[PDB]
Amino acid sequence: TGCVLNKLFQLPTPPLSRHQLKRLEEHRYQSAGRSLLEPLMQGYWEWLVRRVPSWIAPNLITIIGLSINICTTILLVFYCPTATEQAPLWAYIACACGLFIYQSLDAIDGKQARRTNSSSPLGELFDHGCDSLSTVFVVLGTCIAVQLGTNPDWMFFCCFAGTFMFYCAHWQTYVSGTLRFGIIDVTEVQIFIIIMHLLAVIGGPPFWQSMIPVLNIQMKIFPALCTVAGTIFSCTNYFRVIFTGGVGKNGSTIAGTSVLSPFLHIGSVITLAAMIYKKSAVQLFEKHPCLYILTFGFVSAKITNKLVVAHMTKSEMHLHDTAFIGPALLFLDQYFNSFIDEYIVLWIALVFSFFDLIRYCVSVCNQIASHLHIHVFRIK
Amino acid sequence: TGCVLNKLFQLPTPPLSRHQLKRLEEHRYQSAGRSLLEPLMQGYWEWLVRRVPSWIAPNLITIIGLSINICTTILLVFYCPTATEQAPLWAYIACACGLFIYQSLDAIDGKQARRTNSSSPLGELFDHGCDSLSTVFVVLGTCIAVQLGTNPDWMFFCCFAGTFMFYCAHWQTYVSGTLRFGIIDVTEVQIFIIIMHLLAVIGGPPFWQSMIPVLNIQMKIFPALCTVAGTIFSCTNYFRVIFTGGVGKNGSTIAGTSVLSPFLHIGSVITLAAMIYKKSAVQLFEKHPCLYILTFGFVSAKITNKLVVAHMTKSEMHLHDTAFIGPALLFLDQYFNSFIDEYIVLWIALVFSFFDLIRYCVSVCNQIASHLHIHVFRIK
Ligand SMILES: CCCCCCCC/C=C/CCCCCCCC(=O)O[C@@H](COC(=O)CCCCCCCCCCCCCCC)COP(=O)([O-])OCC[N+](C)(C)C
Ligand SMILES: CCCCCCCC/C=C/CCCCCCCC(=O)O[C@@H](COC(=O)CCCCCCCCCCCCCCC)COP(=O)([O-])OCC[N+](C)(C)C
Ligand SMILES: [Mg+2]
Ligand SMILES: [Mg+2]
Ligand SMILES: [Mg+2]
Ligand SMILES: [Mg+2]
């Protein structure tokens, strides 16, 4: 049983060459910046990390957070598959508490890693790889909490904008070699989403459906407008650095590739999602938005994880990836006038994309661990 | 002017690494077999090659043949763009004479190369690369000569079957390391096509439209049926060797890749052509068959040329290639309910695919020539 499962979760050929592997050992973490709310939260996270026993490995801490976040959001998706129903109030509380636990466990893992001298490139790759999956669930859970499914175009834009900003942060890191935090960053966004779930508990759908008298727009559209405002601010900071901050030869990226090369990958993901949405004869996204977001979210998360790998290995990005097979199944089916029900194809695309993501992640983590002679979830 | 044109016909990165280049020098031509009509034709070709002066380089001989073949077929396409009209009789004669000149010039180039001690890997790569382009024009010219445009499904099958058999011959060479000639091969097929053009001169459309009394099928369908019969025979010889003749480790190909890997490339070409045909709302192939065959013919010829390169460099085949961009343009347009007229897109796809083919061929030939310090069309 263990032999068949192990063969299932690794690709037949190793994804990284030995030369990238050697170059990965030379990586040194560099960040430059400070968010607005981080210094107040620093005292809590410094207190919290001291209470954690020294035998818990970093990669085990992050995955506990993600599992809590996944389970609470999947339960919420189970209650509200079209994002139009009202869930029991405790489900939003569970997501609110789950995200708070996630944020607290995430922010202490690198501090714990330093305290126990277990900082390693596996931990850094695993963290950003875990953050990439969690972000998909955060934007989906938020959209359910605000019932954004009644306005699919706003739901489509906001969910894919959030994944694109998170991708752009790693794109900025791929260009400049340094993770740069803005004035409004992950800390403020996550805290705002936690507070938003409690107003959804207190006021429900009637509160969210009320009209803002001065603008004659529904208040429910305001977080989506906040997402627009956030997108301009976040893109402006990243793109200034994208055009001026290339550390490679002749101002290229650190890998020596064109500064526009990551755009093609995330652009293809967003474009495929937009074509399949606007061409669907059965209005697949409007009837099944959570299932749709999860399908393309796993595709987007993997493409982000390849960018993290491309950063960590100082390698080019190949546009051709198996992650696009799932969207292509949806794409080919809709091309033949939906000969199979797109809902069935979407489930097929979901299951494939999930397993393909898991197969990649397990194979990369095991390969790095075998090279460094460390265990992923246990400190020696 | 020369600098801008030179930048246009080469890719920014060299298509072959130095290690493939070194391995290319170790290649030694091996063939095993004899066609039925070749020994009678051998005396003519041995006589003909002795009349050629020793200063004409091999690669210059092949390209003169191809240019004659291209010009006569393109003129025929110009007179009969839907393959339903009747051309002047001299145009079929010109194609008949042009193909006869082609065959005679092709068959003597390697004999001339041996006589002048100018045999080189550039010549072998250029030859099969030239044969791959010529075959597309031969099947198209044949279909015009027999007016197969009145039965598009037969026209589609026969043209793509011929390209697939030619691909399969190189696939067989990629598997077994040796070019193997059948009892019915290129010599018999080309001579049969030459004779067929003269009956089209003598009898015209009324002859070709006459019914075969015993079968109650039109006689015009018989060459297409001959193409079916030829396909079974040719595939049977190639596929027996494909399953038993792998010289690589554990019976794999000589490059160590799966024996099914070339199938995906030619399969994708044939499948894309079939999807675009059956989905076209304007019946693009039925109104414009020659333009359609030329578009996908250049795509197919390039994919064949990559297989020759993959053979000559002992390398794997990458499925991702720029050759598919042109078909994808047709494919994306038809997906959006033909927002642009597919005929305009087909011209765009033709021009792109032609230039992309020419760019690849010029870049590969110049790269090999620079490494071997030889000139492509001149003997020192
Ligand atoms: C709700 C209000 C709307 C807009 C408000 C303004 C938003 C625009 C502003 C933001 C600009 C900054 C870019 C965004 C974050 C990327 C930063 C990054 O590198 O990732 C981080 C991970 O990320 C996570 O922790 C997971 C993401 C959680 C929420 C999802 C973010 C998408 C935005 C959702 C919004 C739309 C959803 C709403 C639905 C309609 C880096 O992780 P780390 O640094 O290794 O972690 C430990 C270190 N730490 C302590 C420093 C963290
Ligand atoms: C018309 C009757 C229908 C069917 C009849 C039976 C067909 C089935 C049987 C054939 C089985 C054999 C496979 C086919 C040939 C591949 C061999 C190869 O390696 O390529 C050769 C090149 O090829 C050329 O010279 C160009 C091709 C010319 C005609 C196109 C062939 C496609 C079939 C069109 C038919 C459909 C079109 C009709 C439209 C309806 C190798 O070149 P070479 O060896 O380096 O050249 C010099 C050496 N030489 C002297 C040895 C040559
Ligand atoms: Mg963290
Ligand atoms: Mg993190
Ligand atoms: Mg020849
Ligand atoms: Mg030849």
Residue numbers in the entry:
A (entry chain B), B (entry chain A): 28 to 407
Task: Pull verbatim passages from the article behind this deposition.
Choline/ethanolamine phosphotransferase 1 (CEPT1) catalyzes the last step of the biosynthesis of PC and PE in the Kennedy pathway by transferring the substituted phosphate group from CDP-choline/ethanolamine to diacylglycerol. CPT1, CEPT1 and EPT1 belong to the CDP-alcohol phosphotransferase (CDP-AP) family, whose members share a common property of catalyzing the transfer of a substituted phosphate group from a CDP-linked donor to an acceptor alcohol. CEPT1 is a dimer with 10 transmembrane segments (TMs) in each protomer. TMs 1-6 constitute a conserved catalytic domain with an interior hydrophobic chamber accommodating a PC-like density.
Eventually, the structure of hCEPT1 was determined to be 3.7 Å resolution using 459,021 particles. A lipid-like density was unambiguously observed in the structure of CEPT1, of which acyl tails reside in the hydrophobic chamber and the polar head is placed in the catalytic cavity. Because no lipid was added during protein purification or sample preparation, the density may indicate an endogenous lipid. However, a portion connecting the 3-OH group remains void, which is enough to accommodate a phosphocholine or phosphoethanolamine moiety. This observation suggests that the density belongs to a PC or PE molecule, the products of CEPT1. After fitting a PC molecule, the phosphate group is close to the carboxyl groups of four conserved aspartates on the CDP-binding motif, which coordinate two metal ions to stabilize the pyrophosphate of the CDP moiety in the bacterial homologs. CEPT1 prefers Mg2+ for PC production; therefore, we modeled two Mg2+ ions at similar positions to stabilize the phosphate group of PC in the structure. Two tails are coordinated in the hydrophobic chamber with hydrophobic residues, including Thr162/Val165/Val166/Thr169 of TM3, Cys185/Met192/Phe193 of TM4, Val213/Val216/Phe219/Ile220 of TM5, and Cys253/Thr254 of TM6. In addition, Gln217 seems to form a hydrogen bond with the carbonyl oxygen of the sn−1 acyl group. The trimethylammonium group may interact with the carboxyl group of Glu65 electrostatically. Two basic residues, His155 and His197, are close to the glycerol backbone of the endogenous PC molecule in our structure.
